[PDB]
Amino acid sequence: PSGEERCIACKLCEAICPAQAITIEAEPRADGSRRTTRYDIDMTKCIYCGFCQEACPVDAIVEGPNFEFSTETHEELLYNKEKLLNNGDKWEAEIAANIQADYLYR
Amino acid sequence: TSVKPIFSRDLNEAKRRVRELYRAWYREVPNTVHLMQLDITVKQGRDKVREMFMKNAHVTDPRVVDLLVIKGKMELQETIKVWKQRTHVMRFFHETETPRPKDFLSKFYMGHDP
Amino acid sequence: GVQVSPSGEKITHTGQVYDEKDYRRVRFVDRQKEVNENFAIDLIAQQPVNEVEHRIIACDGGGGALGHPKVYINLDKETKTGTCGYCGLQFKQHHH
Amino acid sequence: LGLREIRVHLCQRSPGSQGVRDFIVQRYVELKKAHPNLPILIRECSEVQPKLWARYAFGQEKTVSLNNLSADEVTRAMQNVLSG
Amino acid sequence: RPTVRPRSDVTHKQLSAFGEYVAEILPKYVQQVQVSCLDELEICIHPDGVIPTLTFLRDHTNAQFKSLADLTAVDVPTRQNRFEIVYNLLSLRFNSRIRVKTYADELTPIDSIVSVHIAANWYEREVWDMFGVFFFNHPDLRRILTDYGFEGHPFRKDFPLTGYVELRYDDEVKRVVAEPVELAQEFRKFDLNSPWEAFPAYRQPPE
Amino acid sequence: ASNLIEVFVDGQSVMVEPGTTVLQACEKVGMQIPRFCYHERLSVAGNCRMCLVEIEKAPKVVAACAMPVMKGWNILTNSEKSKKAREGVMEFLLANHPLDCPICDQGGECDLQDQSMMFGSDRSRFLEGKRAVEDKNIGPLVKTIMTRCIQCTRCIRFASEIAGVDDLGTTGRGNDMQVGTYIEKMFMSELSGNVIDICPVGALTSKPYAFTARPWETRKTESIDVMDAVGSNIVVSTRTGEVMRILPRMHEDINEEWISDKTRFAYDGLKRQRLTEPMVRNEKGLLTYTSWEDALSRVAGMLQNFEGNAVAAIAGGLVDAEALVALKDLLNKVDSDNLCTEEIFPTEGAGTDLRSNYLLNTTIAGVEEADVVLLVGTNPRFEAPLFNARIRKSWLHNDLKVALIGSPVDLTYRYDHLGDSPKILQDIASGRHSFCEVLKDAKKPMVVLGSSALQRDDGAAILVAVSNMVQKIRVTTGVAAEWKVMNILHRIASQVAALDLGYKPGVEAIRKNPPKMLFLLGADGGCITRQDLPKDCFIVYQGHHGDVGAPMADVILPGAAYTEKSATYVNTEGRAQQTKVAVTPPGLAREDWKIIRALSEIAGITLPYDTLDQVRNRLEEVSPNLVRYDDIEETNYFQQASELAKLVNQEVLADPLVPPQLTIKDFYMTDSISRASQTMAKCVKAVTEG
Amino acid sequence: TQLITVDEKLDITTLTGVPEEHIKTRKVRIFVPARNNMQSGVNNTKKWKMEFDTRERWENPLMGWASTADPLSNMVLTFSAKEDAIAFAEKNGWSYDVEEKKVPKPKSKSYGANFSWNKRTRVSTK
Amino acid sequence: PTTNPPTARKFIWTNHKFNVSATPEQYVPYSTTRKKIHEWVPPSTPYK
Numbered sequence A: 001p002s003g004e005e006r007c008i009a010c011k012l013c014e015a016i017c018p019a020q021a022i023t024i025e026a027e028p029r030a031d032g033s034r035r036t037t038r039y040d041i042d043m044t045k046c047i048y049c050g051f052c053q054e055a056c057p058v059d060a061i062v063e064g065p066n067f068e069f070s071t072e073t074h075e076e077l078l079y080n081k082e083k084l085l086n087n088g089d090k091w092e093a094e095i096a097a098n099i100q101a102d103y104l105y106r
Numbered sequence B: 001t002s003v004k005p006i007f008s009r010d011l012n013e014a015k016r017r018v019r020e021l022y023r024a025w026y027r028e029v030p031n032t033v034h035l036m037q038l039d040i041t042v043k044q045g046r047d048k049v050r051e052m053f054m055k056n057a058h059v060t061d062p063r064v065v066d067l068l069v070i071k072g073k074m075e076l077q078e079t080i081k082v083w084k085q086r087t088h089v090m091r092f093f094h095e096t097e098t099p100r101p102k103d104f105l106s107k108f109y110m111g112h113d114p
Numbered sequence C: 001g002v003q004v005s006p007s008g009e010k011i012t013h014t015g016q017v018y019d020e021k022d023y024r025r026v027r028f029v030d031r032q033k034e035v036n037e038n039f040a041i042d043l044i045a046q047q048p049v050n051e052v053e054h055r056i057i058a059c060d061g062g063g064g065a066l067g068h069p070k071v072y073i074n075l076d077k078e079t080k081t082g083t084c085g086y087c088g089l090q091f092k093q094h095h096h
Numbered sequence D: 001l002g003l004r005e006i007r008v009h010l011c012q013r014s015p016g017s018q019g020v021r022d023f024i025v026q027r028y029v030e031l032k033k034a035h036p037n038l039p040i041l042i043r044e045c046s047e048v049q050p051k052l053w054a055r056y057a058f059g060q061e062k063t064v065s066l067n068n069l070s071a072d073e074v075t076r077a078m079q080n081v082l083s084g
Numbered sequence E: 001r002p003t004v005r006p007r008s009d010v011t012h013k014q015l016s017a018f019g020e021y022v023a024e025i026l027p028k029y030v031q032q033v034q035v036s037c038l039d040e041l042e043i044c045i046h047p048d049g050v051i052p053t054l055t056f057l058r059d060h061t062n063a064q065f066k067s068l069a070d071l072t073a074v075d076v077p078t079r080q081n082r083f084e085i086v087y088n089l090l091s092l093r094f095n096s097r098i099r100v101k102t103y104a105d106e107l108t109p110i111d112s113i114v115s116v117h118i119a120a121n122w123y124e125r126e127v128w129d130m131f132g133v134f135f136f137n138h139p140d141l142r143r144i145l146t147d148y149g150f151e152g153h154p155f156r157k158d159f160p161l162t163g164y165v166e167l168r169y170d171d172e173v174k175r176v177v178a179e180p181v182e183l184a185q186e187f188r189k190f191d192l193n194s195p196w197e198a199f200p201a202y203r204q205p206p207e
Numbered sequence F: 001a002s003n004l005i006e007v008f009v010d011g012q013s014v015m016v017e018p019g020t021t022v023l024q025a026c027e028k029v030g031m032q033i034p035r036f037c038y039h040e041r042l043s044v045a046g047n048c049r050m051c052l053v054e055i056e057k058a059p060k061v062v063a064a065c066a067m068p069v070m071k072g073w074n075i076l077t078n079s080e081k082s083k084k085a086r087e088g089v090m091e092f093l094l095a096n097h098p099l100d101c102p103i104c105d106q107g108g109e110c111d112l113q114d115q116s117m118m119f120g121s122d123r124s125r126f127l128e129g130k131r132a133v134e135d136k137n138i139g140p141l142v143k144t145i146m147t148r149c150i151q152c153t154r155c156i157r158f159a160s161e162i163a164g165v166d167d168l169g170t171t172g173r174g175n176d177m178q179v180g181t182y183i184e185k186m187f188m189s190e191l192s193g194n195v196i197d198i199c200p201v202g203a204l205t206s207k208p209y210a211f212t213a214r215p216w217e218t219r220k221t222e223s224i225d226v227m228d229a230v231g232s233n234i235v236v237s238t239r240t241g242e243v244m245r246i247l248p249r250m251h252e253d254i255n256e257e258w259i260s261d262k263t264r265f266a267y268d269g270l271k272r273q274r275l276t277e278p279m280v281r282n283e284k285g286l287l288t289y290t291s292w293e294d295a296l297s298r299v300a301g302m303l304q305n306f307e308g309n310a311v312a313a314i315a316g317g318l319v320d321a322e323a324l325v326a327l328k329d330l331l332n333k334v335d336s337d338n339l340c341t342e343e344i345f346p347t348e349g350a351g352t353d354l355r356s357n358y359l360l361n362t363t364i365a366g367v368e369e370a371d372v373v374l375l376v377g378t379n380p381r382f383e384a385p386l387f388n389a390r391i392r393k394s395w396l397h398n399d400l401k402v403a404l405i406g407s408p409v410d411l412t413y414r415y416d417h418l419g420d421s422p423k424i425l426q427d428i429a430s431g432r433h434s435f436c437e438v439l440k441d442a443k444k445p446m447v448v449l450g451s452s453a454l455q456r457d458d459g460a461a462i463l464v465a466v467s468n469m470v471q472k473i474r475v476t477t478g479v480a481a482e483w484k485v486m487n488i489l490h491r492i493a494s495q496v497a498a499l500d501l502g503y504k505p506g507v508e509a510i511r512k513n514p515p516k517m518l519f520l521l522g523a524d525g526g527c528i529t530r531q532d533l534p535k536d537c538f539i540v541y542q543g544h545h546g547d548v549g550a551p552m553a554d555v556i557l558p559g560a561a562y563t564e565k566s567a568t569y570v571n572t573e574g575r576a577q578q579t580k581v582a583v584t585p586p587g588l589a590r591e592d593w594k595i596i597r598a599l600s601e602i603a604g605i606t607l608p609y610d611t612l613d614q615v616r617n618r619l620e621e622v623s624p625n626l627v628r629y630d631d632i633e634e635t636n637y638f639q640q641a642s643e644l645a646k647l648v649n650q651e652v653l654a655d656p657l658v659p660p661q662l663t664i665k666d667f668y669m670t671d672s673i674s675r676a677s678q679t680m681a682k683c684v685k686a687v688t689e690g
Numbered sequence G: 001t002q003l004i005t006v007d008e009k010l011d012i013t014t015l016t017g018v019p020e021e022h023i024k025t026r027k028v029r030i031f032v033p034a035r036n037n038m039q040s041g042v043n044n045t046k047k048w049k050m051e052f053d054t055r056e057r058w059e060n061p062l063m064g065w066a067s068t069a070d071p072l073s074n075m076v077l078t079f080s081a082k083e084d085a086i087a088f089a090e091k092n093g094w095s096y097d098v099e100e101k102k103v104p105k106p107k108s109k110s111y112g113a114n115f116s117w118n119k120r121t122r123v124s125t126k
Numbered sequence H: 001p002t003t004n005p006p007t008a009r010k011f012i013w014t015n016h017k018f019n020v021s022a023t024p025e026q027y028v029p030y031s032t033t034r035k036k037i038h039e040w041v042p043p044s045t046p047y048k
């Protein structure tokens, strides 16, 4: 809620990713926080299994409700950190409500 | 020393099986070129068959020669049928890829490869 | 805060801008290079410092299980504020 | 033509390199006095044959195998390499 | 203990008795008989006795294993005979399962059991296609799962995960052509092995 | 069974020496007892209590790391009592351990995590608040997050015994007990990343390797080390074609378990100031990028233009045996013998000829089994930190007597400073000294002459004086003639290999006969420049870093780094070792011997090797010990070398010889990679700042 | 009647289907992997690994990924014995470099040396 | 979301964007890397 990114560059979502669809290059930031520089998710390689969102210890990566994101080129489905943060900023009004409705089961 | 043969006691009947397989391939090449609309000629296909036999022609173990004969018979069977297509039978020619040169100057000019 | 390179393209929160002579800008020709405007470093820099009373303060992300793992920060150094490693929240001991 | 380098490859514990070891231990020093500008590289290894290499002007190397040779014949081979 | 399975020592004892029975009926071929703690009976035989062992287990009166469940191979490329051929057999009469193991190398074929079970036709075709284990007296032994011009046996341990060739459409020749494989990602192997042993029951004696 | 006692573990019946601990007996059978504070190269602490095991018919569990087995004991390692003890100790550690695992650095490298998963429980009964400890600022290399320290004192024991700085310790009592320095202390010594190695938790992590990778990500390539002539074995941890970390390996005869700070943190220089394309001088006189064809064509044209003595080569520190024999073969084919090294070795007497004349003849195990060590003209702490570490280990355990001739430098151990003058060598050889009576009371003498001492003008005089002293020592003591005395401590990775291959050491041949075409195989030392060189002289620089030898070169050929080529390096002991390819060289850079061979064939030199194995065969036929990898095969004929030196007549200089490495700030930057790394810049800044 | 005398070296490289480049121009390394110095556990040793020489891993122009060109990059093979690994490498026809197992040396350990009366092993901190 | 509006945050997009494929405002991938390697700069002064 402060606006700080939740991801802490811990890479265990790409460790558990059964398709090896995530790439999490990282370095210390200017203020010394442990953040990512490259967070790529290949949506053409991802199998949409939610293992990343159930492995993430800070609820950083989520699989929100958008499914109508079909593209006309292969390259547009090769997401990077800017695209993923834009999706998080776009769908936060729905993702937060779903996590509120769901987190007691998980 | 003291191994179990699979078809051939020694190299002579292994070479006999090789000659039988080569005769079968040599006879089947014109029918393959006629049936599957191949760009190549009959001479090119028979030269390719000879090239494959030659690139396998350095082994002196009877079991390995017998297994090569068996695999060649399987390949010949799927060429006798049209199980292999034009793409499958033209994969032997490598018409697309550029061969890596055999000289140190070229292999030094491009790539860190021996 | 997004900045603009002398080439013209925007600079991301990890400054990675293509150079003048880098050919990989045809991918942005007739298209756009999208940069997330909300820089997390600035957004957490503009957050106020929490004044607490104890020597050790526990941090979540703001929820019981919706936040991060519950850590403890030791505010013994009066010179610098203690920052939790997961969030970027800073805490200072109210020693008065 | 023109000797540039001598290399003597030998073994520390071998009956075949015994003459080479005796040659080095008894008349290498006078040889280095005689040629105090000629590199005579002595290399001892575990399981090598006694070998002598004579490197000349434009990279020509003459190789002499000298296993099971005595001190007189190894120093005669060395004088043959030096003279010609 | 609500988190641990029950044991069934009764069926462990039954499988041990039947293992003794088969091992004394066929001493010419049986090399080892073991029963696991999961109550599964494994009989490891010489490769020459595949046909008599499988025939005995197909139609013996006390051992009616007329249904062949599985026929597979395991590549262990550190033993001399690098392929372990495994038959999982089902007894509907006695409601039991048995496992029969034999070994092979790249140049030692095994007699096919198509004359005993007809499912062994396709199962041995798959074993030959994936491991290169030839089968004697197999009707139309050939590839079943690989591509038609495929070279090598991909389920072997020394075969790469991505293979050696890949296919793409080429517009110059107007074909689907094969090229040497070039990955844009390079599958990242992970060393997910803890340096601390987990099971002291399987601690091997030192060399 | 003379002095062997039978002890049982799980019924097995292993024989052990008296004084063997329970943990050592269990690992001799094959079982690794859990531990946190025990380290096999550190003193026994016995405080982590993770190694508690049950002895049969004994009501109290014993600490396996400290308890010696007596007789007929039956160690029940997997008993219920032992498992309960391990669970309790793991629970007590994880009660106050902070849950920082994702933001930590011991992801798959955590002994606490792994031993928790293997021996601890699966839950926590701790319903209280965890403690927190303020962090320290111990240096630019070791980042301290001391909240996750488990108070195991391993860093304290290391810094007291091996590093020997005595700056770390415990302040406080009870749960408030803290590890570190009480004051704001800048813990900066050589061998100081080994606390990052030995810290089982992520309390002491690597600041340059801050958050970049994970152990399951990292591919491990086992290689050797350069920029130190010890030749310590390392592991390069790369990921996605990029060098991420340098860890040590385990070689009991070279570096044991640890490496030095320069080799641990100097990998940052491999991505700065890197030659990536061939370059040639322009018509305006500036270096501009070109292709391999044009660059090697220019070099081949000038090589065909010039005859024998007009072509010369100088080889620097980070040069492999393959490239050295390649350039030697090329210059010999154009009839040039001017194949010089960067640093000087005296050629008088049997200089490069007899291999015993320039080697550490008694090895590092020789330092282990010696009793008196006389260091002449060296600072081993900065010239060869692993060698000095072994000297301190022998000084601690075997009661080694260490004396130093030269400048009084802060070696960690306490030594007898015999003075700072080379006349002490003649004084000892004649016999006038307290150290002379120490030597005549001694049994295993070992003298170590510095290559830095050989770098002086009177290098030949120093070498003959040392050799004469060795002869006097050997005739005074009753040495067994399988024990060597004379040793020479090199500081350059390429030097021993070059001397074995037959390079004339030092650039004095270049000074005597100035060439017109010059080759610089990474020659960044600045020994030869355009002032003492003639007008054009056609300099080509084959190297990986552009530091000193590149801006003065007519052409620049980008070679490979030691992490980028599979190469051969020979250490001070004379042991040849092989490094493997961790990553490929960047840009258009190629392997060095490949560059030389392609140059010869663009020219007219038929080099008889085509692949790396053929280069190794050439190395074997030049000197057949550069292919005996990890072989320590002995030399001889030191009597012959000594009497040749005694024939050589020189007078020693009356100058007090000082090492160039007087302080750690001088230690941190030595070669091109160290000068190019920003981490070493931060190190020298932290050392020089107040 | 079923035994024949064969004096070859058990060459199966014509049957493995590997291209001749990845047979001839390849160097495998046979080794017990070194203990990871960040941990004290030794279970990752004691198995002989065979690996291949590392080839070029370059950078993808589009995404910056690590692209490769050789298939035998992640080819860790596990063997229970050095001779088994040597035999497998010779059978598949790869040139090999084998290095010996580096066991740690047995060391004398005594807790009472930390409190010596005259030796230098006396520590100043527990 | 008229009786139960979502939680308002400053970083949430105030304006929604539909699928922007095959438009000038579409998404193009990068490599946020900062090049990881710095080559060299030869000096501008000729020779010494």
Ligand code: SF4
Residues within 6 Å of the ligand: A013, A016, A017, A018, A019, A020, A021, A022, A041, A045, A046, A047, A048, A049, A050, A051, A052, A053, A063
């Ligand atoms: S949902 Fe996709 S990105 Fe996440 S772990 Fe599964 S395959 Fe990987």
Ligand code: SF4
Residues within 6 Å of the ligand: A006, A007, A008, A009, A010, A011, A012, A013, A014, A024, A052, A055, A056, A057, A058, A059, A060, A061, F102
């Ligand atoms: S998204 Fe979550 S699991 Fe993945 S690296 Fe970031 S914090 Fe770790």
Ligand code: SF4
Residues within 6 Å of the ligand: F097, F098, F099, F100, F101, F102, F104, F105, F106, F107, F110, F112, F113, F148, F200, F201, F202, F203
């Ligand atoms: S040291 Fe180990 S247990 Fe502690 S936070 Fe780090 S990974 Fe977790």
Ligand code: SF4
Residues within 6 Å of the ligand: F148, F149, F150, F151, F152, F153, F154, F155, F156, F179, F198, F199, F200, F201, F203, F204
């Ligand atoms: S900092 Fe690490 S090595 Fe030192 S006492 Fe704490 S846990 Fe042990």
Ligand code: FES
Residues within 6 Å of the ligand: F034, F035, F036, F037, F038, F045, F046, F047, F048, F049, F050, F051, F052, F063, F064, F065, F066
């Ligand atoms: S290992 Fe023995 S108490 Fe720590």
Ligand SMILES: [K+]
Residues within 6 Å of the ligand: F106, F195, F196, F197, F198, F199, F200, F201, F202, F203, F204, F205
């Ligand atoms: K650590």
Ligand SMILES: [Zn+2]
Residues within 6 Å of the ligand: C059, C060, C061, C068, C084, C085, C086, C087, C088, C089
């Ligand atoms: Zn927080």
